[PDB]
Amino acid sequence: MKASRLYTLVLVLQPQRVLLGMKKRGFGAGRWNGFGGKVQEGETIEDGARRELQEESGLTVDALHKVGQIVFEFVGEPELMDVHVFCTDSIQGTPVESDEMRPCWFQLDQIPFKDMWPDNSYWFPLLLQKKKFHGYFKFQGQDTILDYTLREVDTV
Ligand SMILES: Nc1nc2c([nH]c(=O)n2[C@H]2C[C@H](O)[C@@H](COP(=O)(O)OP(=O)(O)OP(=O)(O)O)O2)c(=O)[nH]1
């Protein structure tokens, strides 16, 4: 009986590494994140994901593939986040730091889970195995999960 707002999250996943972005400023700074943000009026979810990737990382790609959907709920916030998660298939430039985000590559045996949002530990492994998923996580603040669900699915 809550409303949701649409967000995207994009993982540039290559065979041996993944690109993540360090939030540099404001509340939440200091954590490594996928690239993403609010979907804007009119644009498709995929086009919103492509735009956020360009804005936050500098990479321009023609196409993404959707791998999952995750709902976030925060204690004290009545609006849910409806997060559509995408991976890149191919990229063709270099990442660039903004004043808001610093991109960095991590080898896939060095995924920095302790410095990522806590839910990422649950769904990232499915993403790495090329599986699709649906998830829901309820947070007290930034660090504490009170309830969550995660299910591999055949169709997002
Ligand atoms: N639980 C969880 N929350 C995340 C992840 N990544 C992520 O940005 N968030 C949270 C932090 C923020 O509350 C929200 C992101 O919203 P935002 O306002 O930063 O998005 P945005 O950059 O489009 O905002 P704006 O600059 O356009 O105002 O989602 C994640 O992987 N897991």
PDB file of C-alpha atoms and ligand atoms in Angstrom:
ATOM      1  CA  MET A   1       0.000   0.000   0.000  1.00  0.00           C
ATOM      2  CA  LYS A   2       3.050   2.165  -0.670  1.00  0.00           C
ATOM      3  CA  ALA A   3       4.140   4.058  -3.724  1.00  0.00           C
ATOM      4  CA  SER A   4       7.443   3.347  -5.431  1.00  0.00           C
ATOM      5  CA  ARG A   5       9.894   5.528  -7.328  1.00  0.00           C
ATOM      6  CA  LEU A   6      11.799   4.176 -10.329  1.00  0.00           C
ATOM      7  CA  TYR A   7      15.593   3.852 -10.251  1.00  0.00           C
ATOM      8  CA  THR A   8      18.238   2.110 -12.312  1.00  0.00           C
ATOM      9  CA  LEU A   9      21.501   0.492 -11.344  1.00  0.00           C
ATOM     10  CA  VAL A  10      24.112  -0.491 -13.916  1.00  0.00           C
ATOM     11  CA  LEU A  11      27.017  -2.905 -13.507  1.00  0.00           C
ATOM     12  CA  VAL A  12      29.757  -2.795 -16.114  1.00  0.00           C
ATOM     13  CA  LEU A  13      30.741  -6.454 -15.749  1.00  0.00           C
ATOM     14  CA  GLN A  14      33.624  -7.706 -17.906  1.00  0.00           C
ATOM     15  CA  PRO A  15      35.060 -11.244 -17.858  1.00  0.00           C
ATOM     16  CA  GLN A  16      37.621 -10.459 -15.119  1.00  0.00           C
ATOM     17  CA  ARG A  17      36.543  -7.189 -13.542  1.00  0.00           C
ATOM     18  CA  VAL A  18      33.604  -4.950 -12.671  1.00  0.00           C
ATOM     19  CA  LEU A  19      33.383  -1.145 -12.679  1.00  0.00           C
ATOM     20  CA  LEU A  20      32.008   0.444  -9.507  1.00  0.00           C
ATOM     21  CA  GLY A  21      31.706   4.086  -8.438  1.00  0.00           C
ATOM     22  CA  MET A  22      32.691   5.657  -5.116  1.00  0.00           C
ATOM     23  CA  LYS A  23      30.074   8.123  -3.931  1.00  0.00           C
ATOM     24  CA  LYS A  24      32.229  11.165  -3.127  1.00  0.00           C
ATOM     25  CA  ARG A  25      29.941  13.633  -1.342  1.00  0.00           C
ATOM     26  CA  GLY A  26      26.855  13.995   0.821  1.00  0.00           C
ATOM     27  CA  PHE A  27      25.064  11.344   2.817  1.00  0.00           C
ATOM     28  CA  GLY A  28      26.073   7.839   1.723  1.00  0.00           C
ATOM     29  CA  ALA A  29      29.540   8.941   0.626  1.00  0.00           C
ATOM     30  CA  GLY A  30      32.294   6.359   0.941  1.00  0.00           C
ATOM     31  CA  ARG A  31      30.486   3.345  -0.521  1.00  0.00           C
ATOM     32  CA  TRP A  32      31.094   1.645  -3.869  1.00  0.00           C
ATOM     33  CA  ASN A  33      27.949   1.475  -5.999  1.00  0.00           C
ATOM     34  CA  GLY A  34      26.689   0.584  -9.401  1.00  0.00           C
ATOM     35  CA  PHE A  35      25.945   3.581 -11.605  1.00  0.00           C
ATOM     36  CA  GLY A  36      22.387   4.729 -11.537  1.00  0.00           C
ATOM     37  CA  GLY A  37      19.705   7.035 -10.322  1.00  0.00           C
ATOM     38  CA  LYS A  38      16.126   8.152 -10.801  1.00  0.00           C
ATOM     39  CA  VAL A  39      14.372   7.421 -14.071  1.00  0.00           C
ATOM     40  CA  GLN A  40      13.105  10.672 -15.608  1.00  0.00           C
ATOM     41  CA  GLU A  41       9.762  11.484 -17.249  1.00  0.00           C
ATOM     42  CA  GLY A  42       9.246   9.895 -20.662  1.00  0.00           C
ATOM     43  CA  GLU A  43      12.443   7.903 -20.925  1.00  0.00           C
ATOM     44  CA  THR A  44      12.348   4.121 -20.863  1.00  0.00           C
ATOM     45  CA  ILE A  45      13.981   2.387 -17.927  1.00  0.00           C
ATOM     46  CA  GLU A  46      16.777   1.154 -20.197  1.00  0.00           C
ATOM     47  CA  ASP A  47      17.367   4.642 -21.548  1.00  0.00           C
ATOM     48  CA  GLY A  48      17.445   6.004 -18.019  1.00  0.00           C
ATOM     49  CA  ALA A  49      20.076   3.407 -17.177  1.00  0.00           C
ATOM     50  CA  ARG A  50      22.144   4.345 -20.232  1.00  0.00           C
ATOM     51  CA  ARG A  51      21.904   8.019 -19.305  1.00  0.00           C
ATOM     52  CA  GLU A  52      22.927   7.460 -15.680  1.00  0.00           C
ATOM     53  CA  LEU A  53      25.879   5.355 -16.763  1.00  0.00           C
ATOM     54  CA  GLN A  54      27.048   8.174 -19.046  1.00  0.00           C
ATOM     55  CA  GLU A  55      26.500  10.904 -16.442  1.00  0.00           C
ATOM     56  CA  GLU A  56      28.125   9.072 -13.561  1.00  0.00           C
ATOM     57  CA  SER A  57      30.892   7.141 -15.333  1.00  0.00           C
ATOM     58  CA  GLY A  58      31.512   8.781 -18.685  1.00  0.00           C
ATOM     59  CA  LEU A  59      30.845   5.544 -20.591  1.00  0.00           C
ATOM     60  CA  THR A  60      28.340   5.711 -23.414  1.00  0.00           C
ATOM     61  CA  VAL A  61      26.892   2.372 -24.491  1.00  0.00           C
ATOM     62  CA  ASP A  62      24.144   1.675 -26.999  1.00  0.00           C
ATOM     63  CA  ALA A  63      22.411  -1.126 -25.135  1.00  0.00           C
ATOM     64  CA  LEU A  64      22.117  -2.706 -21.726  1.00  0.00           C
ATOM     65  CA  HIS A  65      20.554  -5.993 -20.634  1.00  0.00           C
ATOM     66  CA  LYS A  66      18.239  -6.185 -17.632  1.00  0.00           C
ATOM     67  CA  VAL A  67      19.332  -8.747 -15.059  1.00  0.00           C
ATOM     68  CA  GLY A  68      17.213  -8.034 -12.001  1.00  0.00           C
ATOM     69  CA  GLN A  69      14.726  -5.953 -10.065  1.00  0.00           C
ATOM     70  CA  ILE A  70      15.210  -5.013  -6.411  1.00  0.00           C
ATOM     71  CA  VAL A  71      12.847  -3.112  -4.102  1.00  0.00           C
ATOM     72  CA  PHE A  72      14.409  -1.162  -1.261  1.00  0.00           C
ATOM     73  CA  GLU A  73      12.458   0.019   1.762  1.00  0.00           C
ATOM     74  CA  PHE A  74      13.934   2.281   4.463  1.00  0.00           C
ATOM     75  CA  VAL A  75      12.493   2.533   7.948  1.00  0.00           C
ATOM     76  CA  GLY A  76      10.892   5.951   8.215  1.00  0.00           C
ATOM     77  CA  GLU A  77      10.470   6.439   4.435  1.00  0.00           C
ATOM     78  CA  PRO A  78       7.058   5.543   3.017  1.00  0.00           C
ATOM     79  CA  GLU A  79       8.236   5.563  -0.612  1.00  0.00           C
ATOM     80  CA  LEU A  80       9.823   2.377  -1.921  1.00  0.00           C
ATOM     81  CA  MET A  81      12.693   2.290  -4.419  1.00  0.00           C
ATOM     82  CA  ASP A  82      11.897   0.129  -7.458  1.00  0.00           C
ATOM     83  CA  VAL A  83      15.401  -0.532  -8.795  1.00  0.00           C
ATOM     84  CA  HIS A  84      15.908  -2.054 -12.232  1.00  0.00           C
ATOM     85  CA  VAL A  85      19.369  -3.617 -12.489  1.00  0.00           C
ATOM     86  CA  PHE A  86      21.250  -3.817 -15.775  1.00  0.00           C
ATOM     87  CA  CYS A  87      24.576  -5.099 -17.040  1.00  0.00           C
ATOM     88  CA  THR A  88      26.577  -3.769 -19.979  1.00  0.00           C
ATOM     89  CA  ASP A  89      27.245  -6.092 -22.882  1.00  0.00           C
ATOM     90  CA  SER A  90      30.063  -4.038 -24.450  1.00  0.00           C
ATOM     91  CA  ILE A  91      31.667  -0.649 -23.683  1.00  0.00           C
ATOM     92  CA  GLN A  92      33.971   1.444 -25.877  1.00  0.00           C
ATOM     93  CA  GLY A  93      35.595   4.278 -23.869  1.00  0.00           C
ATOM     94  CA  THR A  94      37.294   4.953 -20.503  1.00  0.00           C
ATOM     95  CA  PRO A  95      35.576   5.788 -17.187  1.00  0.00           C
ATOM     96  CA  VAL A  96      35.917   9.373 -15.961  1.00  0.00           C
ATOM     97  CA  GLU A  97      35.666  10.776 -12.418  1.00  0.00           C
ATOM     98  CA  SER A  98      32.965  13.362 -11.687  1.00  0.00           C
ATOM     99  CA  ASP A  99      32.685  15.538  -8.622  1.00  0.00           C
ATOM    100  CA  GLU A 100      29.934  13.128  -7.500  1.00  0.00           C
ATOM    101  CA  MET A 101      31.378   9.667  -8.379  1.00  0.00           C
ATOM    102  CA  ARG A 102      34.835   8.104  -8.801  1.00  0.00           C
ATOM    103  CA  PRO A 103      34.813   4.993 -11.045  1.00  0.00           C
ATOM    104  CA  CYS A 104      37.223   2.201 -10.341  1.00  0.00           C
ATOM    105  CA  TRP A 105      37.765  -1.307 -11.663  1.00  0.00           C
ATOM    106  CA  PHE A 106      37.824  -4.274  -9.285  1.00  0.00           C
ATOM    107  CA  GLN A 107      38.983  -7.752 -10.138  1.00  0.00           C
ATOM    108  CA  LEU A 108      36.251 -10.352  -9.631  1.00  0.00           C
ATOM    109  CA  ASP A 109      38.167 -11.967  -6.756  1.00  0.00           C
ATOM    110  CA  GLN A 110      38.381  -8.519  -5.084  1.00  0.00           C
ATOM    111  CA  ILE A 111      34.752  -7.408  -5.122  1.00  0.00           C
ATOM    112  CA  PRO A 112      34.695  -4.835  -2.241  1.00  0.00           C
ATOM    113  CA  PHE A 113      31.543  -6.121  -0.517  1.00  0.00           C
ATOM    114  CA  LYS A 114      32.400  -4.626   2.892  1.00  0.00           C
ATOM    115  CA  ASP A 115      32.394  -1.156   1.312  1.00  0.00           C
ATOM    116  CA  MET A 116      29.212  -1.748  -0.765  1.00  0.00           C
ATOM    117  CA  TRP A 117      25.579  -1.516   0.276  1.00  0.00           C
ATOM    118  CA  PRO A 118      24.861  -4.640   2.375  1.00  0.00           C
ATOM    119  CA  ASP A 119      22.220  -5.996  -0.021  1.00  0.00           C
ATOM    120  CA  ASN A 120      24.817  -6.244  -2.818  1.00  0.00           C
ATOM    121  CA  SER A 121      26.412  -9.253  -1.063  1.00  0.00           C
ATOM    122  CA  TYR A 122      23.170 -11.179  -1.664  1.00  0.00           C
ATOM    123  CA  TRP A 123      22.374 -10.404  -5.302  1.00  0.00           C
ATOM    124  CA  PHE A 124      25.822  -9.703  -6.807  1.00  0.00           C
ATOM    125  CA  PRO A 125      26.717 -13.423  -6.785  1.00  0.00           C
ATOM    126  CA  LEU A 126      23.627 -14.226  -8.902  1.00  0.00           C
ATOM    127  CA  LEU A 127      24.595 -11.442 -11.272  1.00  0.00           C
ATOM    128  CA  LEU A 128      28.127 -12.924 -11.578  1.00  0.00           C
ATOM    129  CA  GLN A 129      26.692 -16.368 -12.499  1.00  0.00           C
ATOM    130  CA  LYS A 130      24.622 -14.742 -15.277  1.00  0.00           C
ATOM    131  CA  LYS A 131      21.364 -15.453 -13.440  1.00  0.00           C
ATOM    132  CA  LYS A 132      18.406 -13.100 -13.170  1.00  0.00           C
ATOM    133  CA  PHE A 133      16.830 -12.138  -9.854  1.00  0.00           C
ATOM    134  CA  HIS A 134      14.111 -10.404  -7.912  1.00  0.00           C
ATOM    135  CA  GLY A 135      14.898  -8.974  -4.507  1.00  0.00           C
ATOM    136  CA  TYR A 136      13.469  -6.904  -1.674  1.00  0.00           C
ATOM    137  CA  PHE A 137      15.451  -5.401   1.223  1.00  0.00           C
ATOM    138  CA  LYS A 138      14.276  -3.439   4.241  1.00  0.00           C
ATOM    139  CA  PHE A 139      16.917  -1.229   5.862  1.00  0.00           C
ATOM    140  CA  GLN A 140      17.235   0.472   9.213  1.00  0.00           C
ATOM    141  CA  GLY A 141      19.499   3.329   8.151  1.00  0.00           C
ATOM    142  CA  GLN A 142      22.430   2.553   5.887  1.00  0.00           C
ATOM    143  CA  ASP A 143      23.903  -0.541   7.460  1.00  0.00           C
ATOM    144  CA  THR A 144      21.212  -2.855   8.859  1.00  0.00           C
ATOM    145  CA  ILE A 145      18.871  -5.178   6.993  1.00  0.00           C
ATOM    146  CA  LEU A 146      15.694  -6.030   8.951  1.00  0.00           C
ATOM    147  CA  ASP A 147      13.973  -8.192   6.323  1.00  0.00           C
ATOM    148  CA  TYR A 148      14.845  -9.315   2.816  1.00  0.00           C
ATOM    149  CA  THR A 149      13.840 -11.714   0.063  1.00  0.00           C
ATOM    150  CA  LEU A 150      15.879 -12.903  -2.908  1.00  0.00           C
ATOM    151  CA  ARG A 151      14.743 -15.237  -5.672  1.00  0.00           C
ATOM    152  CA  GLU A 152      16.369 -16.299  -8.919  1.00  0.00           C
ATOM    153  CA  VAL A 153      13.915 -15.964 -11.768  1.00  0.00           C
ATOM    154  CA  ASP A 154      13.872 -16.954 -15.405  1.00  0.00           C
ATOM    155  CA  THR A 155      12.218 -13.715 -16.539  1.00  0.00           C
ATOM    156  CA  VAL A 156      12.685 -10.384 -14.801  1.00  0.00           C
TER     157      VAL A 156
HETATM  158  N1  LIG B   1      20.144  -0.532  -0.648  1.00  0.00           N
HETATM  159  C1  LIG B   1      20.835   0.044  -1.656  1.00  0.00           C
HETATM  160  N2  LIG B   1      20.623   1.373  -1.857  1.00  0.00           N
HETATM  161  C2  LIG B   1      21.269   1.989  -2.868  1.00  0.00           C
HETATM  162  C3  LIG B   1      22.127   1.299  -3.722  1.00  0.00           C
HETATM  163  N3  LIG B   1      22.653   2.205  -4.615  1.00  0.00           N
HETATM  164  C4  LIG B   1      22.043   3.376  -4.275  1.00  0.00           C
HETATM  165  O1  LIG B   1      22.274   4.492  -4.904  1.00  0.00           O
HETATM  166  N4  LIG B   1      21.221   3.284  -3.208  1.00  0.00           N
HETATM  167  C5  LIG B   1      20.351   4.280  -2.529  1.00  0.00           C
HETATM  168  C6  LIG B   1      21.059   5.524  -2.033  1.00  0.00           C
HETATM  169  C7  LIG B   1      19.993   6.587  -2.254  1.00  0.00           C
HETATM  170  O2  LIG B   1      19.076   6.591  -1.152  1.00  0.00           O
HETATM  171  C8  LIG B   1      19.262   6.122  -3.494  1.00  0.00           C
HETATM  172  C9  LIG B   1      19.920   6.709  -4.730  1.00  0.00           C
HETATM  173  O3  LIG B   1      19.225   7.923  -4.988  1.00  0.00           O
HETATM  174  P1  LIG B   1      19.977   9.248  -5.506  1.00  0.00           P
HETATM  175  O4  LIG B   1      19.103  10.399  -5.061  1.00  0.00           O
HETATM  176  O5  LIG B   1      21.428   9.211  -5.093  1.00  0.00           O
HETATM  177  O6  LIG B   1      19.859   9.080  -7.114  1.00  0.00           O
HETATM  178  P2  LIG B   1      20.252  10.266  -8.156  1.00  0.00           P
HETATM  179  O7  LIG B   1      21.772  10.336  -8.189  1.00  0.00           O
HETATM  180  O8  LIG B   1      19.440  10.136  -9.434  1.00  0.00           O
HETATM  181  O9  LIG B   1      19.657  11.568  -7.402  1.00  0.00           O
HETATM  182  P3  LIG B   1      19.711  13.073  -7.991  1.00  0.00           P
HETATM  183  O10 LIG B   1      21.186  13.414  -7.989  1.00  0.00           O
HETATM  184  O11 LIG B   1      19.094  12.985  -9.372  1.00  0.00           O
HETATM  185  O12 LIG B   1      18.879  13.837  -6.981  1.00  0.00           O
HETATM  186  O13 LIG B   1      19.376   4.707  -3.498  1.00  0.00           O
HETATM  187  C10 LIG B   1      22.352  -0.154  -3.467  1.00  0.00           C
HETATM  188  O14 LIG B   1      23.107  -0.852  -4.203  1.00  0.00           O
HETATM  189  N5  LIG B   1      21.651  -0.703  -2.448  1.00  0.00           N
END
